[PDB]
Amino acid sequence: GPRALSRNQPQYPARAQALRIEGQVKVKFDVTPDGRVDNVQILSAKPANMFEREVKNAMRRWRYEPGKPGSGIVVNILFKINGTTEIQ
Amino acid sequence: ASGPRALSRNQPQYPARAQALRIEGQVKVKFDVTPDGRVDNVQILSAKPANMFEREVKNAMRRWRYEPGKPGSGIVVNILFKINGTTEIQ
Residues of A in contact with B81 (CB under 8 A): 83-85
Scored b (16 or more CB within 10 A) or e, A41-73 reads eeeebeeeebbbebbbebbeebebeeeebeeee
This structure's resolution (Å) is 1.1
Spatial CA neighbour of A37 closest among A13, A6, A76: A6
- Using DSSP's 3-state secondary structure scheme, residue B32 falls into strand
Q: Name all domains of chain B by residue range, CATH numbers in brackets.
A: 1-90 (3.30.2420.10)
Distance from CA of A40 to the nearest CA of B (A): 15
Cis amide leading into A47 (omega within 30): yes
Distance from CA of A79 to the nearest CA of B (A): 5
Q: How far apart are the C-alpha atoms of A45 and A75, rounded to whole Å?
A: 12
Q: How far apart are the C-alpha atoms of B71 and A10, rounded to whole Å?
A: 49
**Nearest CB to B83; choose among A20, A76, A78:** A20
Determination technique for this entry: X-ray
Spatial CA neighbour of B12 closest among A45, A61, A85: A85
